[PDB]
Amino acid sequence: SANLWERFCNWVTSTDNRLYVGWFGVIMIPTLLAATICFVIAFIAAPPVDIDGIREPVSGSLLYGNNIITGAVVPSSNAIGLHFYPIWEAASLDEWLYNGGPYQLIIFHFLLGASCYMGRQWELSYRLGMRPWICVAYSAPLASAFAVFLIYPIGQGSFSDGMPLGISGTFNFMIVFQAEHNILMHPFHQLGVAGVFGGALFCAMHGSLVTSSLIRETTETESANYGYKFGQEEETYNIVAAHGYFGRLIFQYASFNNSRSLHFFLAAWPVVGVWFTALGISTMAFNLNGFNFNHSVIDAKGNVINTWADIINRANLGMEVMHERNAHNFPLDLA
Amino acid sequence: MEVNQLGLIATALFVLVPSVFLIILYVQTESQQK
Amino acid sequence: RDQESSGFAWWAGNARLINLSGKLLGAHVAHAGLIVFWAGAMTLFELAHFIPEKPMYEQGLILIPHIATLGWGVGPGGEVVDTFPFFVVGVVHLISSAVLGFGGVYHAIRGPETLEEYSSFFGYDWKDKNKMTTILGFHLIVLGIGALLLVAKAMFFGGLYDTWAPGGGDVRVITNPTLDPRVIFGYLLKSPFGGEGWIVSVNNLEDVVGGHIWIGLICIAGGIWHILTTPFGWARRAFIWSGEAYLSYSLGALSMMGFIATCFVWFNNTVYPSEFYGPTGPEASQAQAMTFLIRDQKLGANVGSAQGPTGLGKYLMRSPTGEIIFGGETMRFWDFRGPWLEPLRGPNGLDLNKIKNDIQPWQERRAAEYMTHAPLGSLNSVGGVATEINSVNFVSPRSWLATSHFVLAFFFLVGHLWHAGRARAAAAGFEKGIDRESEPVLSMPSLD
Amino acid sequence: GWFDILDDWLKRDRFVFVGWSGILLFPCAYLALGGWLTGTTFVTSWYTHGLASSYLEGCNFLTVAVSTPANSMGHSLLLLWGPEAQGDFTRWCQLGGLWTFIALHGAFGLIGFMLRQFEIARLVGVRPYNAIAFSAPIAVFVSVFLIYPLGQSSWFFAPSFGVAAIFRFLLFFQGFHNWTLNPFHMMGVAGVLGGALLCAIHGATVENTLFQDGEGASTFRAFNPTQAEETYSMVTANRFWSQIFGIAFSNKRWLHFFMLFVPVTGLWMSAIGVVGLALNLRSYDFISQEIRAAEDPEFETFYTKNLLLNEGIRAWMAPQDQPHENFVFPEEVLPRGNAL
Amino acid sequence: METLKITVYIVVTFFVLLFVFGFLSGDPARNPKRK
Amino acid sequence: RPFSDIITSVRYWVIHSITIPALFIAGWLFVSTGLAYDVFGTPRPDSYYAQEQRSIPLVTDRFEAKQQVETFLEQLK
Amino acid sequence: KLPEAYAIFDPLVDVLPVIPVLFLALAFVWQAAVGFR
Amino acid sequence: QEPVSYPIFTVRWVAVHTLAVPTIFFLGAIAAMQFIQR
Amino acid sequence: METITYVFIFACIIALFFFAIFFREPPRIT
Amino acid sequence: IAQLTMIAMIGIAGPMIIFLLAVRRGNL
Ligand code: CLA
Ligand code: CLA
Ligand code: CLA
Ligand code: CLA
Ligand code: CLA
Ligand code: CLA
Ligand SMILES: CC(C)=CCC/C(C)=C/CC/C(C)=C/CC/C(C)=C/CC/C(C)=C/CC/C(C)=C/CC/C(C)=C/CC/C(C)=C/CC/C(C)=C/CC1=CC(=O)C(C)=C(C)C1=O
Ligand SMILES: CCCCCCCCCCCCCCCCCC(=O)OC[C@H](CO[C@@H]1O[C@H](CO)[C@H](O)[C@H](O)[C@H]1O)OC(=O)CCCCCCCCCCCCCCCCC
Ligand SMILES: CC1=C(/C=C/C(C)=C/C=C/C(C)=C/C=C/C=C(C)/C=C/C=C(C)/C=C/C2=C(C)CCCC2(C)C)C(C)(C)CCC1
Ligand SMILES: CC1=C(/C=C/C(C)=C/C=C/C(C)=C/C=C/C=C(C)/C=C/C=C(C)/C=C/C2=C(C)CCCC2(C)C)C(C)(C)CCC1
Ligand SMILES: CC1=C(/C=C/C(C)=C/C=C/C(C)=C/C=C/C=C(C)/C=C/C=C(C)/C=C/C2=C(C)CCCC2(C)C)C(C)(C)CCC1
Ligand SMILES: [Cl-]
Ligand SMILES: [Fe+3]
Ligand SMILES: [Mn+2]
Predict the structure, then answer these.
(1) C322 in E contact zone (CB under 8 Å)
(2) Which CATH architecture has domain F3-75?
(3) What's the half-sphere exposure (Cβ side, CA atoms, 13 Å) at A218?
């Protein structure tokens, strides 16, 4: 026999489990289970939510006549602000739901759990005697999730200006974001789209170049994928063929010939890209806005000549005038 | 509001006939040998 | 050594200094010179353009305000009466930078490349636990001395710029700081969420100078403690003692301090004043609201029971508790405490009678000047959002500091991830890859 | 005779290959690039929209474009020698002849590269999956720059080559078609983000399961280009991923095919989406929602906010975005949030 | 609703304590190499 | 073949330091004498409007498009 | 701005803050000069 | 590499020279635009 | 009527996750 | 009178140190 602690502590760190569950896991699992329950219940059977603090609720629940596309969990009230608002700081559950209560309840647990998941990846890699820094690559989507759900609220000063948990609500978020800050003329958002477009592109061409160089172990009635028998000691394509293909395509110096460099680069491109746009959202929370060019061309009469930036500014003005129900009078705002 | 009862039938057949197609294909080749 | 006989490419070159102490010492004492050089160079550069009758926040000064907070070169209300402290701070930093760099170039090229054979007190090893705790103890003591310098400035050498002083700020000497642990540790039990706030919620310089005494002496005692103590077993089983682990912990520390710093500089206005840096985030909204009320009141309109085009107030509203706060979208700010707004606040939020008759000139002009200068701007420094035209140019100093320290903190977090991973992997010994002959997974039961 | 000579002079090995495809690829590509570069530099758009879009007029690199033809041209190609400029180069530049010039010559440069990829693959003796994969950007190109203006009344609604002019396209599509709420665009966005997701993770996994074969910490120098022995532990990658996420690849051939499959299909589904808009068939509404918002005026969803916002985008961008209609709206019929 | 505050605090506290005690418990030798 | 072989041979310099300044000056003089304004027909920044036509020029027919724009340039707009 | 005596060195003061970035460039100059070890 | 029976000007020659003379001509023109008053 | 169709499809997708994880076809080295 | 003389000098100050150590061959 041995006592219950030693048994518990090697049950947790068991790397013979079907699914790992670390010391980061024992705190990951409840927070995410709770997040999942509150999302599934609130998307379906929530009451409507007063989000503008002037008594206009919004329905985001399927049961009050939404489909999948329009449904959402509707953010916390403008009256509640940046306050901590659990069930026991409300007078009744009725009015905790009325103030967008479940929104805070999903996101705190979810962000916490998503960081504990980042911890778990490192722990499993440490137990399997493999290299770290898959967890460094996970910090990119995670930092964007933080920026969107927690930083941008602190900065604008309420959790009403969060992003609702839904599709059309996400679209509403994008459209009001563009009107009030013009994110397309921010250079960082431009590096973010470059990283995603280039990431997708390098994925496609990597896939094609490797699958076109595969060796002949098959026949023309059985799929090509039964050439690999699992955990071969023989790499399953010939690098110099693909290299020789790419090397005639653009040129001899434009074609990698070290798979280790290729894969490092394959991992490096979008991750740097996503960092840059995540930070871009985070600086706009303090209201460092995209570049704005008003009238870059003026002639001798001293009369303006429009640019495409001006057509975009007209649209921005359109959206922004619609996102202000709070009065006709607003001179220098946000916030 | 409205629900469209031909739209109901539309999804019902859409999700049935290929799931049934795939379940038969998977079952007859596993029921044979070596 | 200095080619590919060391186990690092040129882009990891600085990592060849893990086992050479003198070369490493030269590298750091040379880099200290740069930090100091920029301090001095930048405040001289700022001062060469400084107009000393124009407020500091509308001209971009971000190093002169730190000196102004210490109440040097300023009169009452945060005006400049003389510009000499600025010049002398900058020029003496720029001069001392040379002395640091000289030691740099010497220890890097002329000095012994190993200090363990040279000296046995500047001789040190990352695996020798005792040396690290002793050096840590020294370093805690010079930080302890550093913490008491501010207390000296506060009590003896003309004090600090108090912005809570009567009739706008004035330099005031602390003559009684709190030495009461109850109040002091009470700040660390508060919730970080809005409304309450953590250590950021400081509202007076008595707590500031008092806490500086408190942290100073706990670190003098702890510094003395790590010279006279050897680390314990559970402490040794809780760690990796490697030259890189210390760096990982420290990166973790710096990333936490950056998150805390960017929270400070955005919200507080006791340690980052409103007369040397612009208004804060809520301060402009509250100002806009306050000056609107004041304007429309002179027409003889009823503003105290006025209902909106959605009801629920037009100028004033009820908070959840029932205090009279500002209406519209200024209903998410009522956690704002300003020096200029507080003489008007009754026993449960603002009292409309105090508004009618107890307006002092500096308050209504502070509110009116802060209205047209709210934290916004673009990355090519021109005021406002993307609808308005380029004709006014504003970027709060608050936003520069906030954005910079935020992105540097995020990058210092991911660096802590990296160096912790390297230190952990190198300790166990699979940081050069996975050994061919034997591998863990080939000796582990297959999942089904 | 002379044919097999022309053959082996082309198909010969050189610093950069040419081939039969070279004959189509190189002129067309070079003219299209060159056209865009002179168009962004000297050429106005003041006789068409009332814009300036060149360095000669004083615009920066973020606001230039080779702008579309005028609305009155219809779908005319506007040929230099044709009866809309009649052998005159200046008017041909003013009327937007460079847009079509660039568009057609770039359209043939794309076919040239596509053919070039086939030819080099047939020569080297590998399978041509890279050319099949390259049909997704041509699908997108001819669905957005050719089929979409040919479904409308002119080239004027097509995107102009330039960064800000594409931004205006994004806003236009959002405003008039509600483009994000159409499922083909949902599928395209997903396909593309999934491509980006697979990229980071595949690189990160291969680079963090590498074998020890070096002496330095850097493992970039432990590689020889030969395939004799494996370069990463696939078994370890599978065991890791099956435990942290639940499912894993255990077949390299399939992993790389999945990498090919996700973004190319995404772009194909989106190409079907934009040809659907060319007839003005556009997912814009759910009828159940209109009848409900009609019988109950205190119902709200985010979808209703999006339609009010779409009203704002259209009503405020239409005047200077469709000058050929000579629209004039009073200041009292523009939509306003505060009027609700 | 007052009982609810206390039992949520106790649950949270239980999990954070297992976590810290778990990381004090011999973690740098849980690796498959050099244990 | 490497740039090292190209960056050194005297014949490379004796052509290049002679051709490139002529091209640089040809490119400079092309805009500075205002010829780019006539060959592309782009307006100067005192010729976007006129004192009888204060609206944007717009083409509205496609076979007299030529004549329409020549009319706008003939009246000194 | 600066005391009237030092006013002569107004250009010298304007070129001070960009001296830090140069160190990082010099380190690459150095490395390429010794041919990258 | 480019052929070894050496035609007098090879294929590399036109490739570098269709991208040599326009960009020299262009960055001389774009530079002149900067000194237009406007 | 519409809500049932939705939740039935979501229910099918999470049951598929369970079956796909705990009743897979076991990948085994040769 | 020129003060542009030191802005001239201060940009070449760096590589001149390395240039001479590469003339005086040793310890680059
Ligand atoms: C703050 C303290 C600190 C210290 C002392 C170290 C120390 C070290 N790190 Mg680390 N690191 C840190 C923070 C720190 N790091 C952070 C915050 C990150 C996140 C990015 C990293 C990420 C990191 C990685 C990924 C690696 C290291 C490595 C190393 C070692 C070799 C580094 C080297 O030679 O680079 C020489 C540096 C260069 C060639 C970079 C030059 C950059 C240029 C060209 C442009 C810079 C632009 C600038 C960022 C933008 C503003 C510019 C301005 C002018 C406007 C060394 C022991 C390496 C190692 O062995 O790790 C175990 C390795 O692989 N570090
Ligand atoms: C502030 C930044 C910083 C600092 C302090 C250092 C310091 C050092 N590095 Mg690093 N390094 C850095 C940035 C820095 N590096 C960056 C960004 C990179 C990326 C390129 C590298 C890449 C790198 C590599 C690859 C290597 C080093 C090495 C070294 C050591 C070289 C010693 C030597 O023989 O130099 C000899 C150099 C010279 C004679 C020329 C430079 C001249 C100097 C010393 C002065 C220049 C400034 C100024 C004019 C002096 C004013 C003095 C005045 C105050 C009186 C030294 C301790 C080496 C090492 O670790 O070896 C053990 C090695 O191989 N470094
Ligand atoms: C802060 C970092 C630092 C560190 C750790 C060192 C460490 C060292 N230096 Mg360096 N040095 C520095 C910065 C630093 N130096 C700077 C900024 C410069 C420019 C001034 C120099 C220039 C320098 C040179 C040129 C030389 C040294 C020497 C020495 C060695 C002395 C060995 C001995 O037995 O000393 C015994 C001496 C003492 C214990 C007492 C020293 C008292 C002095 C000189 C300074 C006191 C400053 C201050 C008032 C202290 C206040 C403390 C306070 C808490 C009350 C030692 C390894 C010499 C050596 O051999 O290096 C290998 C040598 O040639 N130093
Ligand atoms: C014997 C005791 C002793 C003492 C007193 C110091 C003192 C110091 N060390 Mg240290 N050191 C020691 C032993 C010691 N060392 C040993 C054994 C080693 C191992 C080789 C090192 C290695 C070491 C390194 C590598 C570094 C230091 C640094 C520092 C400085 C920290 C400055 C600071 O916190 O800035 C914040 C400032 C304050 C808290 C204000 C200090 C006010 C006082 C107490 C001193 C002011 C006067 C003094 C003469 C220094 C003037 C600095 C000038 C630029 C203005 C400080 C001067 C660092 C440094 O900055 O060096 C340049 C650095 O990189 N130390
Ligand atoms: C700031 C720099 C610094 C650093 C780097 C260290 C480093 C270290 N100190 Mg130390 N210490 C310092 C300053 C510092 N000390 C000062 C200034 C004091 C005086 C007050 C102390 C008093 C002190 C004591 C009493 C002891 C050490 C010990 C140690 C070792 C601890 C080993 C361990 O695993 O602890 C891990 C510790 C924990 C996991 C418990 C933390 C309990 C607290 C503080 C927080 C719990 C988390 C909680 C959720 C945070 C809430 C915060 C809230 C405000 C939001 C380590 C070598 C030990 C040693 O061996 O010395 C030789 C020992 O007994 N230190
Ligand atoms: C191989 C490359 C190539 C290709 C495919 C094209 C293709 C094209 N060019 Mg282009 N062009 C090229 C090279 C090329 N060009 C070069 C090198 C230059 C510089 C001299 C130009 C300059 C140029 C200009 C300035 C313009 C075009 C235009 C066009 C388009 C209009 C139709 C046309 O002229 O078709 C090309 C081919 C033909 C018209 C005919 C080919 C006839 C053949 C095959 C056999 C004829 C048999 C016989 C004699 C018929 C007798 C009949 C009788 C008995 C009745 C079309 C897409 C225009 C455009 O894009 O407008 C929007 C335009 O403005 N071209
Ligand atoms: C109440 C509730 C919950 C309601 C539900 C609300 C809600 C919004 C539901 C969602 C439904 C919804 C609206 C869906 C819309 C979109 C939809 C139908 C899309 C599918 C159609 C589509 C786009 C088709 C074409 C493109 C396509 C195939 C895209 C798929 C993109 C996608 C997510 C890909 C998977 C990415 C992924 C996470 C892969 C992980 C792979 C993996 C295990 C790698 C690890 C790994 C790496 C290695 O390197 C090696 C070596 C090994 C060994 C190894 O293992
Ligand atoms: C539907 C989601 C379910 C998810 C399920 C899985 C996850 C959750 C697992 C745990 C679920 C059970 C958690 C424990 C619930 C406790 C019951 C509870 O809420 O009762 C407290 C609830 C509170 O009742 C609330 O009251 C409010 C007004 O204050 C409002 O009316 C609320 O709507 C009403 O819910 O009351 C009752 O249930 C009825 C009265 C019970 C009286 C006996 C209680 C015990 C008495 C001794 C202990 C008192 C402790 C406080 C005083 C300390 C000393 C000063
Ligand atoms: C190691 C190394 C490095 C680095 C280095 C460093 C980092 C250094 C620094 C150093 C330093 C940090 C320096 C500084 C210097 C300075 C000086 C020397 C100054 C002087 C000044 C004076 C003398 C003043 C004057 C004046 C006055 C008094 C007043 C008015 C104004 C004037 C300005 C005129 C590198 C990477 C590069 C390379 C490799 C190695
Ligand atoms: C009043 C005031 C003040 C002061 C204050 C003070 C007094 C402070 C304190 C401070 C403090 C008092 C801090 C603390 C911190 C802490 C931390 C940060 C933590 C630590 C720990 C850790 C980190 C751990 C780790 C771990 C775990 C958890 C598990 C097991 C294992 C290990 C080891 C890994 C001032 C100045 C502002 C002024 C004004 C007011
Ligand atoms: C239209 C036309 C045509 C054609 C023409 C051509 C073909 C032209 C060409 C032209 C060209 C072909 C041009 C080019 C130009 C170039 C440019 C525009 C460049 C730019 C560059 C830059 C800007 C740079 C930048 C950079 C980089 C890249 C790297 C890093 C650094 C830096 C940033 C500096 C023809 C006669 C048939 C017919 C009539 C019409
Ligand atoms: Cl809205
Ligand atoms: Fe791959
Ligand atoms: Mn907002």
Answers:
(1) no
(2) Up-down Bundle (1.20)
(3) 14
